């Protein structure tokens with residue numbers, strides 16, 4: 046079927062066989078091998094043997110270091126230009142701009158970043174041809190969701206980064222069993238390169254290949270493709286997680302009747318043995334992983350983790366909102382993780398875990414701001430910049446967005462249904478983020494439509510207070526106004542069991558800057574209130590913003606120093622300015638795409654505030 050050797054890359058395969066691949070997977074591999082010109086093709090099998098050899102290869106090449114204090118843990122230190130997601134280099138391609146993002150009246154959208162097909166083809170051709178020369182193209186067959194679950198979706202990621210292969214093995218289900226479950230079905234095409242073909246055109250920093258100037262993380266939902274160039278950093282290179290399981294999946298979800306969300310999923314059991322599952326959307330840096338893995342301070346309660354970051358949710362035939370965690374691991378922020386703030390994370394990450402951009406102690410352990418573990422006198426610290434470091438120094442020892450990447454199976458409180466293919470039944474959905482003033486510890490939405498407004502109106506402090514609706518602002522796969530209409534439409538599904546919606550604020554401060562609520566495992570007292578409210582307990586007082594706990598409804602035993610008047614207070618003046626601000630934002634940023642029911646909820650809140 047060829048006049049020379051066709052596009053047959055068999056001679057370059059150093060693991061597996063191109064002949065073993067489904068036809069359309071082979072076409073995707075060979076077309077991109079032609080384009081990108083890798084030296085080798087490695088078809089990943091997901092085996093332990095393969096993982097061992099991969100880690101050895103990286104260690105021998107100086108790309109990662111073994112952390113000798115622990116069982117099979119590893120440390121990567123990146124070029125400091127490649128440490129986080131780059132929103133401004135993250136784009137979605139569609140025929141029409143407005144299908145991706147509403148058109149902002151001000152000319153600056155906060156809700157996504159569109160690129161035309163024409164501009165993208167130019168950007169692609171300026172980056173990918175020959176980009177893998179001298180490197181290995183790894184072929185990662187992966188499932189998002191339990192292997193074979195009706196809610197799961199398969200991708201193929203091609204990458205030139207063994208760091209991406211190792212981290213994908215932890216964060217997804219990957220290898221031959223996925224190829225077998227795939228057969229001749231559809232898959233999301235995921236193409237990644239660090240963008241540094243050999244011979245190197247620019248010097249490597251910290252032995253970490255990347256191309257910051259040409260970094261581009263693109264999503265082509267109408268082609269079912271994700272194409273990412275120039276960054277090796279997690280959210281940009283592990284294409285299953287944010288690219289696929291939020292941006293592409295949210296659009297698929299809109300078309301197919303389900304939801305793909307930046308939500309943890311936890312199961313909570315009370316002292317009577319009754320168990321409920323809850324989902325919660327908080328922005329990055331606002332504590333999802335702590336809540337998901339909570340060690341409750343209240344006696345007789347238990348929390349178990351289904352996932353800490355992404356939820357795929359669909360109503361079943363009985364009307365339950367069923368949720369799965371499409372991930373296979375936790376890619377969690379390391380700084381601030383301690384026995385105090387997340388003891389179950391500390392237990393999970395002591396074996397089989399890859400750390401990126403944390404500090405290293407002289408006895409081969411890990412360190413970061415907030416770890417709250419004293420070192421023995423004499424033990425020294427190497428920062429994430431590979432310099433000696435001491436606590437007086439101007440800069441932190443770990444990057445503030447440094448991460449662990451750890452298997453979910455390992456977590457001592459992983460829920461027994463964390464891989465159940467039908468998902469877990471969600472009875473409450475929680476929104477929240479960082480509000481230093483005005484917003485009380487917890488309230489309950491008055492209706493589904495009020496609850497969708499509460500998600501839509503979310504704001505959180507990060508370089509000042511900014512809108513982050515549904516905790517999805519970096520992640521919408523399509524126009525946010527349409528996303529709101531999709532959520533609202535869930536109310537019209539016959540016999541839907543609509544979860545109760547809450548909003549929390551762990552971050553309210555007094556006039557001195559001091560947190561009013563101790564948080565962490567004490568948040569169990571808030572979850573107890575939610576649980577009772579889902580049970581229909583008469584534990585709520587009506588206010589203009591929704592229901593709050595009655596006086597004495599929260600268990601505050603052991604917290605007598607809490608300033609309940611300040612923590613629970615609602616000011617007419619604060620809320621008048623809040624509605625003022627929400628109205629300006631929705632008009633500027635959503636305008637013609639704003640659903641009527643959102644506008645009505647905004648008017649209803651304003652009216653309730655007016656009667657204060």
Ligand SMILES: Nc1nc2c(ncn2[C@@H]2O[C@H](COP(=O)(O)OP(=O)(O)OP(=O)(O)O)[C@@H](O)[C@H]2O)c(=O)[nH]1
Pocket residue numbers: 327328329330331332333334335336354376377378381386551552560563564565568
């Ligand atoms: N005061 C207070 N801070 C909290 C609480 N829970 C978490 N935090 C803070 O939240 C931060 C940790 O949250 P992250 O792990 O970055 O948040 P995340 O939502 O998991 O973020 P992504 O993994 O990026 O999606 C740290 O600053 C913690 O101190 C709480 O109950 N009270």
Ligand SMILES: O=C([O-])C(=O)[O-]
Pocket residue numbers: 130280328329354376
């Ligand atoms: O950036 C994030 O939200 C993350 O990696 O989870």
Ligand SMILES: [Mn+2]
Pocket residue numbers: 333334353354376377378
């Ligand atoms: Mn997290």
Ligand SMILES: [Mn+2]
Pocket residue numbers: 307329354
């Ligand atoms: Mn996240």
Ligand code: NA
Pocket residue numbers: 107108109121122123124251252253
């Ligand atoms: Na490095």
